[PDB]
């Protein structure tokens with residue numbers, strides 16, 4: 001049974017970002033303006049066209065689809081096709097109320113690479129963590145069974161070595177070509193890859209092996225069909241591991257941000273302090289203050 | 301008006317990309333019309349980008365939505381918009397030939413984690429038996445080919461290399477900038493052949509490579525993603541230079557290795573690349589895949 005936007009009104013302020021290639025758009029709207037003091041609140045609405053489901057496509061092209069002809073020559077031709085309802089799903093995400101840090105992160109990527117030494121991390125990044133980081137209340141809600149409980153795909157309930165595996169916010173669950181799940185560990189205070197030590201190895205292995213095994217049993221998808229990894233920098237500073245279909249070229253799966261869990265585990269087995277000592281490469285917005293901070297602790 | 305045929309029986313998904321919301325289908329058409337004898341068609345379908353004004357308008361009309369879930373300030377929904385947002389770009393090849401089929405066909409991939417042993421016992425023996433030609437490299441290195449496009453060359457036979465646009469780039473804009481660097485010293489097959497003796501070749505590549513791109517394109521190093529493939533397609537060490545902003549195919553973690561961390565990895569673990577297990581993806585029909593899977597069963 002269908003619902004409405006969790007707010008009234010939406011008046012466009014700004015296209016934070018759009019991409020014709022990815023068929024996606026992120027908008028900052030003013031909402032609820034006809035109440036209280038008349039200023040309203042900020043929201044972000046994100047609209048993404050969805051992947052095709054080949055069977056519905058094959059069934060459509062078997063009949064007489066609604067078409068207009070755009071180019072014609074001999075054996076080539078391009079139409080505009082207007083499918084029935086069922087092929088038109090647009091994946092819609094709402095952030096509301098949206099904070100100033102949301103508005104910043106969803107804006108116009110003009111990105112710069114940076115190489116962060118262990119020392120740059122203790123000295124510069126760590127003490128500046130608040131400014132990179134978003135509320136993890138949603139993570140607590142899942143771990144506490146207050147949101148998304150009926151979506152949980154698997155749980156290892158151990159307080160220390162356990163975790164919850166659930167469909168990622170980006171996956172609309174309608175097909176397996178873009179399978180995307182997330183594992184969040186039960187244990188609090190592991191912010192990111194920089195916190196990881198051999199003490200976490202049991203936790204890591206369980207995410208890797210019981211996560212893959214749970215995906216094999218739920219979706220029949222084999223581990224050699226999965227790309228399993230973490231982000232550095234993450235947006236939410238509670239360790240989280242991303243399980244994607246390998247043939248899905250997921251945004252954020254690039255060598256400049258993604259780290260395979262299998263390698264992370266073996267890195268720890270070979271090199272207990274590897275994540276505190278070594279240098280990690282990632283991208284930051286041009287104008288992000290932390291970039292400036294870091295550029296200045298290494299140039300001179 | 302109409303599709304150029306009647307009936308569609310799916311024969312094969314030649315290629316798909318959920319990320320780009322595109323599929324390439326081969327179907328059999330006309331099987332319940334004319335003589336009864338079906339033909340070949342390719343039909344490519346692609347979702348369209350949004351238009352701001354149509355989206356704004358839809359949103360201020362407060363539409364109805366099917367809730368997927370909510371959590372705190374977050375929520376997601378299925379939206380079934382009115383016709384004007386729903387257009388699909390439908391390209392048809394009819395009748396299509398076996399050439400059209402081969403043009404669009406892509407193999408599905410499979411992950412493998414190749415130990416240092418796996419590489420010694422299985423991949424290396426396989427690759428000396430079977431490899432794609434590295435002539436085209438040779439042609440460049442010794443000026444018979446593409447000398448009209450060199451961006452930079454350091455000639456030192458032991459640590460030098462030539463830097464040319466990759467064929468993937470039409471050179472009309474810097475958005476999708478892509479270059480390869482091929483080294484002068486011969487027989488470096490891939491990453492698996494790298495040791496601390498390579499440190500000058502590597503350093504060389506990264507550093508003079510960036511300087512060349514700076515002077516030629518006005519593009520700073522922090523704007524560049526620089527890396528090698530494992531497994532490469534061509535077994536003569538080759539370094540890839542792409543614009544940071546360009547989400548280049550093949551820059552995924554399951555394939556790409558940052559040049560600079562390959563360097564530091566040599567510095568702290570001299571045997572790294574002969575001992576450590578490396579991860580990569582193979583085509584479903586690659587004989588190497590069956591070999592590795594059989595060795596690890």
Ligand SMILES: C[n+]1cn([C@@H]2O[C@H](COP(=O)(O)OP(=O)(O)OP(=O)(O)OC[C@H]3O[C@@H](n4cnc5c(N)ncnc54)[C@H](O)[C@@H]3O)[C@@H](O)[C@H]2O)c2nc(N)[nH]c(=O)c21
Pocket residue numbers: 046093105106138148166167168169170182230231233234235236237240242251252371374
């Ligand atoms: C709030 N939240 C985030 N995730 C998922 O948790 C992971 C956190 O992962 P991470 O810490 O490594 O950070 P990441 O940067 O990947 O997450 P973010 O959500 O900021 O995604 C990165 C970028 O991808 C882009 N993007 C494409 N679609 C969306 C979308 N729908 N929402 C936000 N960003 C999107 C944005 O440009 C964004 O900055 C992400 O994969 C996110 O979908 C959630 N999953 C559930 N199940 N319930 C949640 O409530 C939830």
Ligand SMILES: C[n+]1cn([C@@H]2O[C@H](COP(=O)(O)OP(=O)(O)OP(=O)(O)OC[C@H]3O[C@@H](n4cnc5c(N)ncnc54)[C@H](O)[C@@H]3O)[C@@H](O)[C@H]2O)c2nc(N)[nH]c(=O)c21
Pocket residue numbers: 405406407408436446464465466467468480529531532533534535538540550583
């Ligand atoms: C022949 N050639 C190739 N390159 C470029 O050299 C680099 C070699 O780099 P690499 O050794 O690590 O190989 P990579 O795997 O990147 O090569 P490429 O993208 O071309 O892969 C090879 C081929 O296999 C095909 N292919 C890739 N995946 C699939 C799949 N999944 N299914 C079916 N076919 C696939 C490709 O379309 C292509 O024909 C590539 O980035 C390539 O564009 C060249 N550059 C110049 N300047 N002059 C050349 O003549 C030249």
Ligand SMILES: [Y+3]
Pocket residue numbers: 037039
């Ligand atoms: Y006020």
Ligand SMILES: [Y+3]
Pocket residue numbers: 037038039
């Ligand atoms: Y006011």
Ligand SMILES: [Y+3]
Pocket residue numbers: 055
């Ligand atoms: Y079915």
